[PDB]
Amino acid sequence: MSARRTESDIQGFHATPEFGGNLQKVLVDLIELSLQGKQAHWNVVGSNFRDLHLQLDELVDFAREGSDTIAERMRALDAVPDGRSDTVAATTTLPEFPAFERSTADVVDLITTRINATVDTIRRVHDAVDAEDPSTADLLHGLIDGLEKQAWLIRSENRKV
Amino acid sequence: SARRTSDIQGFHATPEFGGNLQKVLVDLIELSLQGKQAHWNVVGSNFRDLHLQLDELVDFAREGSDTIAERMRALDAVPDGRSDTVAATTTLPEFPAFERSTADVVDLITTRINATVDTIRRVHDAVDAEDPSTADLLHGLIDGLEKQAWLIRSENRKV
Amino acid sequence: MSARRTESDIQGFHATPEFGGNLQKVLVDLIELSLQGKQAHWNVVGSNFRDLHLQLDELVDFAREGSDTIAERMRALDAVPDGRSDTVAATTTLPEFPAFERSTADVVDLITTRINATVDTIRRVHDAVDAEDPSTADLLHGLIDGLEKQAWLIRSENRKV
Amino acid sequence: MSARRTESDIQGFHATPEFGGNLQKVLVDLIELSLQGKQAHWNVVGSNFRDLHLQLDELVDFAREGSDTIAERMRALDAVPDGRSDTVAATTTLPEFPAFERSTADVVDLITTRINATVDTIRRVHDAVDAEDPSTADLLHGLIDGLEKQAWLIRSENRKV
Amino acid sequence: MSARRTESDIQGFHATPEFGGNLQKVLVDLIELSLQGKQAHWNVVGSNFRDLHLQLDELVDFAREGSDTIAERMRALDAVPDGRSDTVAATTTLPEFPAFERSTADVVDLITTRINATVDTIRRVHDAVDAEDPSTADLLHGLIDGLEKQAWLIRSENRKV
Amino acid sequence: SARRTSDIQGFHATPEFGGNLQKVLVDLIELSLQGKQAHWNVVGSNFRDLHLQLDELVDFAREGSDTIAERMRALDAVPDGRSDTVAATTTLPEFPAFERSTADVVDLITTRINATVDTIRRVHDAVDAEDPSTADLLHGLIDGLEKQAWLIRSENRKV
Amino acid sequence: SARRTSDIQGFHATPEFGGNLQKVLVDLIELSLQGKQAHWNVVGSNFRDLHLQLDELVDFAREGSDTIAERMRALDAVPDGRSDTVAATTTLPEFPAFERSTADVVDLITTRINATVDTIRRVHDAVDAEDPSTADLLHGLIDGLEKQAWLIRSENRKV
Amino acid sequence: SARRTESDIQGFHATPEFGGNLQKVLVDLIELSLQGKQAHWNVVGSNFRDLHLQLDELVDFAREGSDTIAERMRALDAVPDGRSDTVAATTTLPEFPAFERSTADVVDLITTRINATVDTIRRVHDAVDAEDPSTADLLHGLIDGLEKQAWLIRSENRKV
Amino acid sequence: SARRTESDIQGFHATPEFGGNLQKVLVDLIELSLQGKQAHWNVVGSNFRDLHLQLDELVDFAREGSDTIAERMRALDAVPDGRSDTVAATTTLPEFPAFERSTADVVDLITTRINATVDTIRRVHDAVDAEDPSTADLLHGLIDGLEKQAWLIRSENRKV
Amino acid sequence: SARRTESDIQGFHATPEFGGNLQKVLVDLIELSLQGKQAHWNVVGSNFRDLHLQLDELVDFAREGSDTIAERMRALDAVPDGRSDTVAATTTLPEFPAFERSTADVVDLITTRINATVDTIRRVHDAVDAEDPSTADLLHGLIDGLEKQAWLIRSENRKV
Amino acid sequence: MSARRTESDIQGFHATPEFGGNLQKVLVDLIELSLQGKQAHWNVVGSNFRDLHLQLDELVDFAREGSDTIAERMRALDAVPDGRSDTVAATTTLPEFPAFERSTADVVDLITTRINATVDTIRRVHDAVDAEDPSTADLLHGLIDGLEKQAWLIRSENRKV
Amino acid sequence: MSARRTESDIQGFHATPEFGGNLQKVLVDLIELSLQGKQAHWNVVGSNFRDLHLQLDELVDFAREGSDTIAERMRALDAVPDGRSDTVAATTTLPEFPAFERSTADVVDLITTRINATVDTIRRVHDAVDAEDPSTADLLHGLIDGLEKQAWLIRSENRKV
Ligand SMILES: [Cl-]
Ligand SMILES: [Cl-]
Ligand SMILES: [Cl-]
Ligand SMILES: [Cl-]
Ligand SMILES: [Fe+2]
Ligand SMILES: [Fe+2]
Ligand SMILES: [Fe+2]
Ligand SMILES: [Fe+2]
Ligand SMILES: [Fe+2]
Ligand SMILES: [Fe+2]
Ligand SMILES: [Fe+2]
Ligand SMILES: [Fe+2]
Ligand SMILES: [Fe+3]
Ligand SMILES: [Fe+3]
Ligand SMILES: [Fe+3]
Ligand SMILES: [Fe+3]
Ligand SMILES: [Fe+3]
Ligand SMILES: [Fe+3]
Ligand SMILES: [Fe+3]
Ligand SMILES: [Fe+3]
Ligand SMILES: [Fe+3]
Ligand SMILES: [Fe+3]
Ligand SMILES: [Fe+3]
Ligand SMILES: [Fe+3]
Ligand SMILES: [Mg+2]
Ligand SMILES: [Mg+2]
Ligand SMILES: [Mg+2]
Ligand SMILES: [Mg+2]
């Protein structure tokens, strides 16, 4: 006749502090990447300026969408993101982007290593995230895939023969 | 050439697998129906936001039920989304009739989303073991519905 | 100021219990139709599968919009809809949809019959609705027109001439 | 050539002075509603500001399209609309909208009353319009349906249940 | 199961021969109007050519959608349309469109007359249609409203005031 | 400067050229009317595909008739697309009244498309000789209609 | 760090500034209402162009009135766009009732656009002196409306 | 096995005369675009709006056409010249008059200039067709599109 | 302070075996796209139009898939080969027959070829997943999308 | 004849002080975007959804603004710095608090931060306007757009 | 009175075997070009990577649309295309694309010559195609025009001074 | 009671001859820039061809929209533009664009200086324009901003380190 549950209060999945911290690690590197990507996008100069200028904006869009995805996933699982400038600066694992104008070739190298660093954070955190919540790991897979594609589209400028 | 030889069959789901997807399906349809009920009948403070959010929940739940039912079809299982079956087999607590306050609707719908996510989380490991590709569809459902739960329940949060 | 009314409270048109009842009847058959339409959509097999599979989704879209229209018209007029599964199952006039895979020929006949049953409810209810509120009768005309079109587009498959 | 008429001049349906008058009444209340809707849109403050601010614009859009529909229906039938400010102020049936910032709770009650007044004009006029020209009565049904929906979506904010 | 009907065959509403005949009359005049509209569209010359050239296409679009609506309403109700050239020529009530280039002033008067003739057919037929099937009468109201609007937008060109 | 001197006339078509375009025009309008007739009245196996395809044929034929009529206007010819003229001068076999089966509609409409293409192919060389630019418009019509014929007739093909 | 210390207020307009924006607002609303009146009731030679152009004028004037009213709100002023206020305080010459010829509508509407632009030009320097950002909004209004005046009045031009 | 073995295969090169023929088309299309904008701005009088709008449509077609011609030239390794001095010095179009012009006058002036542009395309047609039929198809699009514009514009002044 | 100090950080490199696994997927997706177009053109008979259209949808999914796989390979510094000779020489799909084929025959032929393509993805899945779970997620999308196409197509021939 | 004969004509160069003024605007716009996202994620309580949505609209306007300012700097050969350390070290905005915050608190906090950002633009306005009026027009768009956001947000807490 | 033809069976234009073979020649080179274009698009590396990467996808889109156009034209004229991988490999006239990564400059040269080869096929076949069916030659003109434009947009990267 | 003005004739703002001449100066340089931009767009050859080819079209679009804006502003203020080829050639201040193909690096330098020259015209004219009509100066600000952005996006190709 009926299979209906009877509780008036059914709780949702709550992330462990460890899991929250792991997604926080991903968050700050994604925001930092976005900030560095815009810096590069503004200040890149030299041969093949336009392509890099445009590709860098694609990277920024992806990293911004990613940071919102991770922060919102945290919220869904009762964890609390911190994307404030001071926290991002204090805790990001990305090497800092240099000041002033940079050459196209230099920007290609710099941004590639910074995407690599961002992806490394996600891969380092992956197995612990997957173990607690496979659905979140799928979002991580999307980030890895999208970011490694950006790294290919950007780095290929400097690859010879 | 590496070309194979002329009637290669598709992956077919075990009865148990079909049954697990059936469990997900009825709770998604029930959620969709309950969501529309809430959408129409919610009243009170912050009516508009709740009215609108609930329609988005319904869209997701309907897309989800279609995704699951069609995955069943692809793997040679047979969905049953009929009204009697859904009423008879859904695990979701019954949604009340009549007008309900926004605060009560927030609480009620959060419970019923969580019930739906619970079903998907309950079958996840057994479907993943048999067909990882289907578990990915389940992950999208878990992610999307848990997002909806957060967006809805935050209205009632204290500090 | 010349022709302005001075009432603080000007109340809206309220549906009678009979009117609310009449729209409730339309609502449950529209929802049942949507549920059966999807069942048929998923489970139809055989000759001209795709055309039928697609047409059934178009039927479902129309019935879903129809049920939302009806229910919101109820709300506008201070009536209260009930589209919950138990209610729809217990009160719909539509013949039950059979279980399992069904042939395209079978689905055509089954769905045509279910559409006609839905239209019949709207037609039975029409005059009482029109008498109380002509504006709602127009929404009923939209439903009659749209559903009878669906019936034609579906039934024509099985017509032998 | 067999069933073709041979008249050089075939004139169209012309509204009677009464019909023109009846549509004029609908027109001024629709325009007044749009003006009050915008006033409320700009000046509403307090709890749930944004929802109300947005809904009021949706109301205004519907009332503006409504007034254009009515006025052009008049023109089609050789009647002449008057939507000028002095005329609208001197002949509208709507209670005056108050000046200054108003709370969201106040705006809900005020605007619900103004919508209902507008609908009341259309409802009072309906039968005389329907008797002369059923096609125009259908446009009135669109207005009744659309405005009563607006009233429901707005008033529900203040409902305590 | 409680209120479910148990009939294998539930048939739809079937138009009487009179109803089918009445919609046939509307159909041929709509098609004739589309054909004359295009003729006028191509062959109009003189002052304010472009405005007229464009408006005539808008008229044609509406009449084409109208004829499709009518014919499909016939099909829905088990009636059979005939929109073939010989039938339209032999049975239309519209005065014949003249050959050759025609002035913008001439086209305005000619097309206004043809529109009015088309509307007259719908108006003559309306009550018999409404009596049998109110839902179809609503489609007629759409046509009356849309065509009379077209007539206004076209005739206003020649109005001297 | 290479600037010319103030009333340079446009290319004007011979009466014969206008007449040839008139021939194309009436068969395109007739096809459009016959296509709609078929669209409404077709019934039976694979109704939906045929119903939909026929509407695409009508769209093409209507766009085509407008293209030809306006080319006539551009070259100072005067189209006649009126109902009596079309009925009196079309080369297309009459389409039957009443409901027709999908199989019969496929055969009937294929014949009438082919008749329309035949007209365009019949006048092609004489229009090309006078105005190559107009023959390009004819080529688009031949291509598009012959595509329609293939898409429609394939339904009835044996093996 | 250069971070400030927790209740920094927004720029607030003087009463005079609010009043000047109020002046612009009522003339924009009046223009919108007059434009629709003209749009409906214009008849005669070149009806369609005028009918259509007048609707574009109305769109601009409505967008403009919303821009001004919301700028008032942002700067803590309170708009009054009510029918009585607009009728009582607009500087625009009354638009006549009844059908008017296209030639008369061109002249009438040009005058009333110019009246509206005149108001904005009259308050410009006093608003610019207080808040340059608001004067930019006024510039868009001057530009757009003067464009409308040109597009409308050109119909009546002699040689 | 059917594969050609040459490492570099050359594409079709246009003769310089062919390039010169397309160049004639180009300058007249650019001149027409420039005159069309002049007319679009400066037209006044009865039925102003229709003409103002129709003139912009002409300009859009003419600008798209000149891009099509110049890019066809580049495809075949010809080199277009669309610079102002070249256009002014080599266009065959009668000069457009200065100042405001009535809609009636603009209709006649622009019809003539469209007809002049079309005439250039028609004059080079056979020489272009003989060398490269694909390019002649682009000429056909231009003839068709421009003669349509001529009809749409001149119809305003037709008294029947 | 948490910032890494190395000037160049290396990204994830796929093993050559991983690249080889994705390569198997790629050739079958390309072969499937090519056979799908062959079927789309040459299908005739009852319910022609639905099949003609469904086959193009399959081709779109298969083309998008092969781009996804080839670009994932490039991301991980593998090097795809989608050239005709390689596809023909290394595809595991049964050859599609020449000439016109009936809708019934096309349904069965294409179902088999979709099933063959899916089988390749399923065969390499675990080896791909073990090295790079993110890539396995792309494999899942392909399995899901292709098996849907198989269902949508084969249903035409199902007799119940 | 009116043509200038110099082979290279220099564009307008911004003084370094001008660049510095735009830099102040930039860091506050970026800080505002970052705080806006923080608020957007962490806001809870009555009327959550409206605020959640309005905060994203603010973030979109602020991100577009910072791009506009940074690109205006580049146009005039100034060099922006939008890096996290620089933003944190040089923003004039009060720090946004950690953790979940109520909708009422978020309304007041964000209004203040919008007002701080606007104040920076208003402070540099006259110095920017004196050197380059075109840039001051961009400042006006920002003032107008941000003060609108301030009104739309703070209205939630207004008790009348 | 009537100009209507009387045959119940009117056949369509049927291509000669020679014509079918000529379009088949065009088909395989278009498919081969598409395959090579994607290979280049994936494997291009070096200065100005992105522009070439993107342009190559434009070329692929055009060649794919072209192959479908030619194959469908064949079908319209009762000819039977063969676009299978074995046939394409066995019969294409394009020099094969090399394996592995290639430099931007190398890809520009390689793809230019392969477009040149594809266009050469169409030009070689042109006159015989035109003689039998001028409408098909027009499709060939589109292919020539579109492909030679691609060749210009791609080759210009390597052109100096 | 009433604040309505009483004149039946209210004139619009009329530009001085000087102001008209100033906007004319802006106009011819914008048209010249558009003409040169297309010349460069067609004839640019070499490393990073595609980016420049595309960016040049963006510049052309902006300069075309600008020329229409200025000419229409002139018309609004009763001034009469001259954008004819002879006038543009006789009066533009831009150095002429060279003939034949030019290298990417050369085009970057050439176009940058020509944008610089166009902007210089607008800046030279600015204060006199602003003094008479601040609203027109705002349009000039848009042109300056948009053109200087183009100059940055184009020139950055040639900027080293
Ligand atoms: Cl379809
Ligand atoms: Cl919203
Ligand atoms: Cl228009
Ligand atoms: Cl790009
Ligand atoms: Fe996924
Ligand atoms: Fe997984
Ligand atoms: Fe209706
Ligand atoms: Fe009625
Ligand atoms: Fe040709
Ligand atoms: Fe200013
Ligand atoms: Fe062509
Ligand atoms: Fe501005
Ligand atoms: Fe978000
Ligand atoms: Fe589905
Ligand atoms: Fe709803
Ligand atoms: Fe209107
Ligand atoms: Fe239809
Ligand atoms: Fe047309
Ligand atoms: Fe607003
Ligand atoms: Fe271009
Ligand atoms: Fe790609
Ligand atoms: Fe940017
Ligand atoms: Fe195709
Ligand atoms: Fe313009
Ligand atoms: Mg079918
Ligand atoms: Mg809210
Ligand atoms: Mg006009
Ligand atoms: Mg590049």
Question: Which residue type occupies L64?
Answer: R
B154, B150, B157, B79: which is closest to B117 by C-alpha?
A: B150
Q: K157 C-alpha to center of ligand 20: Å?
A: 16
Dihedral sign (CA D5, D7, D13, D17): negative
Rounded-to-integer distance, Cα G157 and Cα G137, Å: 30
Going by C-beta distance under 8 Å and a sequence separation of 6 or more, which residues neighbour residue B120?
Answer: B24, B27, B138, B141, B142, B145
Q: Do J92 and G3 touch (CB under 8 A)?
A: yes
Q: How many CA atoms within 13 Å lie on the side-chain side of B159?
A: 2
Do A96 and A63 meet the contact criterion of CB atoms below 8 Å apart? Answer: no
What is chain I's length? Answer: 160
Question: Which residue type occupies H76?
Answer: L
Helical packing angle, L134-155 and A49-76, nearest 10°: 100
Dihedral sign (CA E79, E81, E87, E91): positive
Q: Do E47 and H51 touch (CB under 8 A)?
A: no
Collapsing DSSP to helix, strand or coil, J47 comes out as coil
Rounded-to-integer distance, Cα G136 and Cα J140, Å: 7
Do I146 and I61 meet the contact criterion of CB atoms below 8 Å apart? Answer: yes
**For residue D77, how far is the Cα from the chain centroid?**
19
Q: For residue A44, what are the β-bridge partners? A: A102
Q: Using a CB–CB cutoff of 8 Å, tell me whether K156 touches chain L.
A: yes
Nearest chain F residue to E57, by CA: F66
L104, L59, L152: which is closest to A47 by C-alpha?
A: L104
Q: Using a CB–CB cutoff of 8 Å, tell me whether B78 touches chain I.
A: no
Do J58 and J114 meet the contact criterion of CB atoms below 8 Å apart? Answer: yes
**For residue H48, how far is the Cα from the chain centroid?**
24
Q: Using a CB–CB cutoff of 8 Å, tell me whether C49 touches chain F.
A: no
Q: Which residues of K are annotated as a binding site for Fe(2+)?
A: 41, 57, 68, 72, 138
- Contacts with K, L 6-45, CB within 8 Å: 44-45
Q: Which two tokens stand for residue A56?
A: 């860098």
Q: Which helix (H) or strand (E) holds F125?
A: helix F102-130
Do J77 and J17 meet the contact criterion of CB atoms below 8 Å apart? Answer: no
Q: Using a CB–CB cutoff of 8 Å, tell me whether D152 touches chain B.
A: no
Q: What is the least distance, in Å, from the CA of A157 to any CA of chain K?
A: 5
Q: Provide φ and ψ at L110, rounded to 5°.
A: -55, -50
Q: Which two tokens stand for residue D50?
A: 């944004």
Collapsing DSSP to helix, strand or coil, G100 comes out as strand
Rounded-to-integer distance, Cα D131 and Cα D154, Å: 32
**Contact pairs from chain G to chain L, CB under 8 Å:** 64
Q: Which two tokens stand for residue F85?
A: 């003229």
Q: H55 C-alpha to center of ligand 24: Å?
A: 9
Q: Do C157 and F49 touch (CB under 8 A)?
A: no
DSSP secondary structure letters along I67-108 = HHHHHHHHHTT------HHHHHHH--SPPPPSS-EEHHHHHH
Rounded-to-integer distance, Cα F76 and Cα F10, Å: 9
Dihedral sign (CA G136, G141, G147, G149): negative
Chain C contact probe: residue of F39, F47, F98 with most C CBs at under 10 A:
F47
Rounded-to-integer distance, Cα J24 and Cα J80, Å: 10
Q: Which two tokens stand for residue G18?
A: 């609010």
Q: How many CB atoms lie within 10 A of CB A115?
A: 27
Q: Do L76 and G135 touch (CB under 8 A)?
A: no
Q: How many CA atoms within 13 Å lie on the side-chain side of C4?
A: 18
Q: For residue H44, what are the β-bridge partners? A: H102
Q: Name chain D contacts of G41, Cβ cutoff 8 Å.
A: 75, 80-81
Do A147 and A113 meet the contact criterion of CB atoms below 8 Å apart? Answer: no
Helical packing angle, B47-74 and D49-76, nearest 10°: 90
Residue indicated by tokens 């109803």: E19
Q: Which two tokens stand for residue G59?
A: 């769109």
CATH fold of the domain at B5-159: Ferritin (1.20.1260)
Chains A and K in direct contact, meaning 3 or more beta-carbon pairs closer than 8 angstroms: yes
Q: Name chain H contacts of K112, Cβ cutoff 8 Å.
A: 11
Rounded-to-integer distance, Cα C51 and Cα C57, Å: 10
J81, L156, L151, L148: which is closest to A45 by C-alpha?
A: L156
Q: K155 C-alpha to center of ligand 4: Å?
A: 17
Q: Provide φ and ψ at I134, rounded to 5°.
A: -60, -40
Q: Which two tokens stand for residue G70?
A: 């919301």
Residue indicated by tokens 């007034």: D67
3-state secondary structure K44-106: EECCCHHHHHHHHHHHHHHHHHHHHHHHHHHHHCCCCCCCCHHHHHHHCCCCCCCCCCEEHHH
Work out the burial of residue K6: count CB atoms within 10 Å of its CB; fewer than 13 is exposed, 13-18 middle, 19 or more buried: exposed
Q: Name chain I contacts of B7, Cβ cutoff 8 Å.
A: 108, 112
Do C112 and C153 meet the contact criterion of CB atoms below 8 Å apart? Answer: no
Q: How many CB atoms lie within 10 A of CB D21?
A: 13
Residue indicated by tokens 């209260």: C80
| H helical segments located in chain A | 17-43, 49-76, 85-91, 104-132, 134-155
Q: How many CB atoms lie within 10 A of CB K4?
A: 16
Residue indicated by tokens 């997706």: I29
Q: Provide φ and ψ at E91, rounded to 5°.
A: -125, -15
Q: What is the least distance, in Å, from the CA of E161 to any CA of chain F?
A: 34
Q: For residue K102, what are the β-bridge partners? A: K44
Rounded-to-integer distance, Cα I15 and Cα H104, Å: 76
Collapsing DSSP to helix, strand or coil, D92 comes out as coil
Question: Which residue type occupies E118?
Answer: T
Residue indicated by tokens 């294929």: F110
3-state secondary structure E115-138: HHHHHHHHHHHHHHHHHHCHHHHH
Interior CA angle at G57 toward G53 and G60, to 5°? Answer: 135
Q: Which two tokens stand for residue J78?
A: 């100034």
**For residue E18, how far is the Cα from the chain centroid?**
18
Q: What is the least distance, in Å, from the CA of H141 to any CA of chain G?
A: 30
Rounded-to-integer distance, Cα D83 and Cα G54, Å: 15
Q: Provide φ and ψ at J5, rounded to 5°.
A: -105, -10
B58, B72, B7, B3: which is closest to B28 by C-alpha?
A: B58
Q: For residue E102, what are the β-bridge partners? A: E44
Q: Which of the following CATH numbers is that of domain J5-160: 1.20.1260.10, 3.40.1350.10, 3.60.10.10, 3.30.300.30?
A: 1.20.1260.10
Work out the burial of residue C131: count CB atoms within 10 Å of its CB; fewer than 13 is exposed, 13-18 middle, 19 or more buried: exposed
Has E53 been labeled as part of a binding site?
no
Q: Do E145 and D134 touch (CB under 8 A)?
A: no
Q: Using a CB–CB cutoff of 8 Å, tell me whether L149 touches chain H.
A: no
Q: How many CA atoms within 13 Å lie on the side-chain side of E65?
A: 12
Q: Name chain C contacts of E4, Cβ cutoff 8 Å.
A: 92-96
Q: Which two tokens stand for residue C41?
A: 């959509």
Q: Using a CB–CB cutoff of 8 Å, tell me whether D160 touches chain B.
A: yes
Dihedral sign (CA C130, C135, C136, C139): positive
Rounded-to-integer distance, Cα C85 and Cα B33, Å: 7
Rounded-to-integer distance, Cα C16 and Cα I122, Å: 61
Rounded-to-integer distance, Cα C150 and Cα G33, Å: 44
Do B9 and I115 meet the contact criterion of CB atoms below 8 Å apart? Answer: yes
Q: Which residues of K are annotated as a binding site?
A: 41, 48, 51, 57, 68, 72, 138
Q: What is the least distance, in Å, from the CA of G95 to any CA of chain D?
A: 8
Q: Do E50 and H46 touch (CB under 8 A)?
A: no
Q: Which two tokens stand for residue K123?
A: 């030009």
H10, H66, H72: which is closest to K146 by C-alpha?
A: H72
Q: How many CA atoms within 13 Å lie on the side-chain side of E76?
A: 22
Tell me the helices (H) and strands (E) count for chain F, helix number first.
Answer: 5, 2
Going by C-beta distance under 8 Å and a sequence separation of 6 or more, which residues neighbour residue L37?
Answer: L56, L57, L59, L60, L63, L111
Q: Which two tokens stand for residue D113?
A: 């009353």
Do F102 and F45 meet the contact criterion of CB atoms below 8 Å apart? Answer: yes
Q: How many CB atoms lie within 10 A of CB H7?
A: 9
A86, A37, A101: which is closest to J90 by C-alpha?
A: A86
Q: What is the resolution in angstroms?
A: 2.0
Going by C-beta distance under 8 Å and a sequence separation of 6 or more, which residues neighbour residue I64?
Answer: none
A102: left (phi over 0), alpha (psi -120 to 50) or beta: beta
DSSP secondary structure letters along D96-138 = PPPPS-EEHHHHHHHHHHHHHHHHHHHHHHHHHHHHH-HHHHH
Chains B and I in direct contact, meaning 3 or more beta-carbon pairs closer than 8 angstroms: yes
Diameter of chain F by CA atoms? 70
**For residue D93, how far is the Cα from the chain centroid?**
12
Going by C-beta distance under 8 Å and a sequence separation of 6 or more, which residues neighbour residue H20?
Answer: none
Do I103 and I47 meet the contact criterion of CB atoms below 8 Å apart? Answer: yes
J160, J132, J119, J106: which is closest to J17 by C-alpha?
A: J132
Q: Which two tokens stand for residue A48?
A: 């093949």
Q: Using a CB–CB cutoff of 8 Å, tell me whether L140 touches chain J.
A: yes
Work out the burial of residue K14: count CB atoms within 10 Å of its CB; fewer than 13 is exposed, 13-18 middle, 19 or more buried: exposed
Has F80 been labeled as part of a binding site?
no
Q: Do F70 and H151 touch (CB under 8 A)?
A: yes
Q: Using a CB–CB cutoff of 8 Å, tell me whether I95 touches chain K.
A: yes
Helical packing angle, B102-130 and B47-74, nearest 10°: 20
Going by C-beta distance under 8 Å and a sequence separation of 6 or more, which residues neighbour residue D100?
Answer: D43, G78, J160
E6-161 falls under which CATH superfamily? Ferritin, core subunit, four-helix bundle (1.20.1260.10)
Q: Which two tokens stand for residue J106?
A: 């978020």
DSSP class of residue F156 equals G
Q: F150 C-alpha to center of ligand 20: Å?
A: 36
Collapsing DSSP to helix, strand or coil, B2 comes out as coil
Please state, in angstroms and as integers, the Cα–Cα distance from residue I40 to each residue in D96, G101, I45, I58, K60, following that order. Answer: 67, 61, 12, 10, 19
DSSP secondary structure letters along F62-121 = HHHHHHHHHHHHHTT------HHHHHHH--SPPPP-S-EEHHHHHHHHHHHHHHHHHHHH
Dihedral sign (CA C96, C97, C98, C100): negative
User: What is the Rg, in whole angstroms, of the alpha carbon atoms belonging to chain B?
Assistant: 18
Q: Which helix (H) or strand (E) holds C45?
A: strand C44-45
Rounded-to-integer distance, Cα B14 and Cα E14, Å: 48
What is chain F's length? Answer: 159
Neighbouring subunits of L (3+ Cβ pairs under 8 A)? A, G, H, J, K
L156, L29, L19, L153: which is closest to L94 by C-alpha?
A: L29
DSSP secondary structure letters along A62-85 = HHHHHHHHHHHHHHHTT------H
DSSP secondary structure letters along chain H = ------S----PPPPHHHHHHHHHHHHHHHHHHHHHHHHHHHEESTTHHHHHHHHHHHHHHHHHHHHHHHHHHHHTT------HHHHHHH--SPPPPSS-EEHHHHHHHHHHHHHHHHHHHHHHHHHHHHH-HHHHHHHHHHHHHHHHHHHHHHGGG---
Do G25 and G81 meet the contact criterion of CB atoms below 8 Å apart? Answer: yes
Q: Which two tokens stand for residue E72?
A: 């499909």
Do J51 and J106 meet the contact criterion of CB atoms below 8 Å apart? Answer: yes
Do A80 and J38 meet the contact criterion of CB atoms below 8 Å apart? Answer: no
| Kind of pairing between the strands at B100-101 and K44-45 | unpaired
**For residue F16, how far is the Cα from the chain centroid?**
19
Dihedral sign (CA G139, G144, G149, G151): positive
Q: For residue D45, what are the β-bridge partners? A: D103
Collapsing DSSP to helix, strand or coil, L158 comes out as coil
**For residue D90, how far is the Cα from the chain centroid?**
16
